[PDB]
Amino acid sequence: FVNQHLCGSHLVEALYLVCGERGFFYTPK
Amino acid sequence: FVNQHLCGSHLVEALYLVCGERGFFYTPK
Amino acid sequence: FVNQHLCGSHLVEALYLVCGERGFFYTPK
Amino acid sequence: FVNQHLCGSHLVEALYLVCGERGFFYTPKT
Amino acid sequence: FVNQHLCGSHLVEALYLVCGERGFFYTPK
Amino acid sequence: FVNQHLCGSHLVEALYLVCGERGFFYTPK
Amino acid sequence: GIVEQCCTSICSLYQLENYCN
Amino acid sequence: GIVEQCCTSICSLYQLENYCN
Amino acid sequence: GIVEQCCTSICSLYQLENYCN
Amino acid sequence: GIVEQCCTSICSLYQLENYCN
Amino acid sequence: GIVEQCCTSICSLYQLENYCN
Amino acid sequence: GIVEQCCTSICSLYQLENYCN
Ligand SMILES: Cc1cccc(O)c1
Ligand SMILES: Cc1cccc(O)c1
Ligand SMILES: Cc1cccc(O)c1
Ligand SMILES: Cc1cccc(O)c1
Ligand SMILES: Cc1cccc(O)c1
Ligand SMILES: Cc1cccc(O)c1
Ligand SMILES: Cc1cccc(O)c1
Ligand SMILES: [Cl-]
Ligand SMILES: [Cl-]
Ligand code: NA
Ligand SMILES: [Zn+2]
Ligand SMILES: [Zn+2]
């Protein structure tokens, strides 16, 4: 639902910063 | 490079929205 | 309502991306 | 260009906050 | 809570804009 | 260009994440 | 409108495009 | 704090300005 | 346009208010 | 997944790192 | 990579789709 | 200041902690 959708947008930003050069895969499920 | 860092942050948010349930991979490498 | 405020912030950014050169009106009401 | 694209993304968020309940109109047309 | 975490992320961006040259302190406690 | 404004916008969100409950201080100096 | 429709359940980008000018 | 004060009811710009330096 | 007016130099709150509905 | 794990309760930076490539 | 391809010049949402998995 | 130190060369999350309270 929308809450999970909003949370996910912030999660990918955090991963971007935390993972740096390593990169990351984002799998919502 | 900070300009690339900033661009990357926006790219990740664009990918999150465009890919949806499919998810995406962000490998800046 | 703050939840709606936060939802809107994200809607606005998605519209910016999806609408492109067409632009958009954000009319909460 | 990319710079204007990045700038615009922030402009819409500033307009969202500035305008509040009134809402706003965003057009990148020169 | 995550809702609080999400709300805070937006609050700091709003403070960044409203405070301008004055800057601000974000003290969640 | 508004590069310094854009940079600060991202710095603030990164500080929010990095600093947690300690919070942070943002001064555009 | 957009709020009633998209804050309640997830709108796809296609659905959001409806609100474009 | 600002969280308790602005995360349920929307704070106006003036209310936010109270947290500026 | 707004990008021309606000992306080279920063726009004031008053200048951004021009675009509110 | 990361949603289930981190959208109910807050994940630290260290825990998010668990999801990096 | 996506950086070289999309930060040097703008990528359409259609081009960004290449990075969905 | 943080702008002088972090807006040309990327500050590591480690470096950014210098600006925490
Ligand atoms: C992209 C987006 C943001 C917020 C709500 C939605 O339904 C969709
Ligand atoms: C602008 C803003 C963001 C988050 C909560 C608020 O009350 C106000
Ligand atoms: C990106 C941005 C935000 C606010 C004012 C501006 O002129 C530009
Ligand atoms: C940084 C962050 C964002 C969203 C959810 C989390 O648990 C953590
Ligand atoms: C949507 C988006 C963000 C940043 C760069 C791009 O080319 C495209
Ligand atoms: C390129 C693209 C992807 C998804 C929805 C759209 O309206 C456009
Ligand atoms: C995380 C971040 C944002 C902006 C500039 C930096 O050096 C680092
Ligand atoms: Cl949110
Ligand atoms: Cl930016
Ligand atoms: Na690895
Ligand atoms: Zn940006
Ligand atoms: Zn949010």
UniProtKB/Swiss-Prot annotation, chains A, B, C, E, F:
Q: Name the consequence of H10D.
A: In HPRI; Providence
Q: Any coiled-coil ranges, and where?
A: none
Q: What is the effect of changing R22Q?
A: In MODY10; reduces binding affinity to INSR; reduces biological activity; reduces folding properties
What name has this protein been given in UniProt? Answer: Insulin B chain
Encoding gene (name): INS
Span covered, complete protein: 25 to 53 of 110
From Swiss-Prot, chains G, H, I, J, K, L:
What organism is listed for this UniProt entry? Answer: Homo sapiens
S-S bonds = C6-C11
Q: Which residues form a coiled coil?
A: none
**Name of the molecule in the record:** Insulin A chain
Its taxonomic path starts at: Eukaryota, Metazoa, Chordata, Craniata, Vertebrata
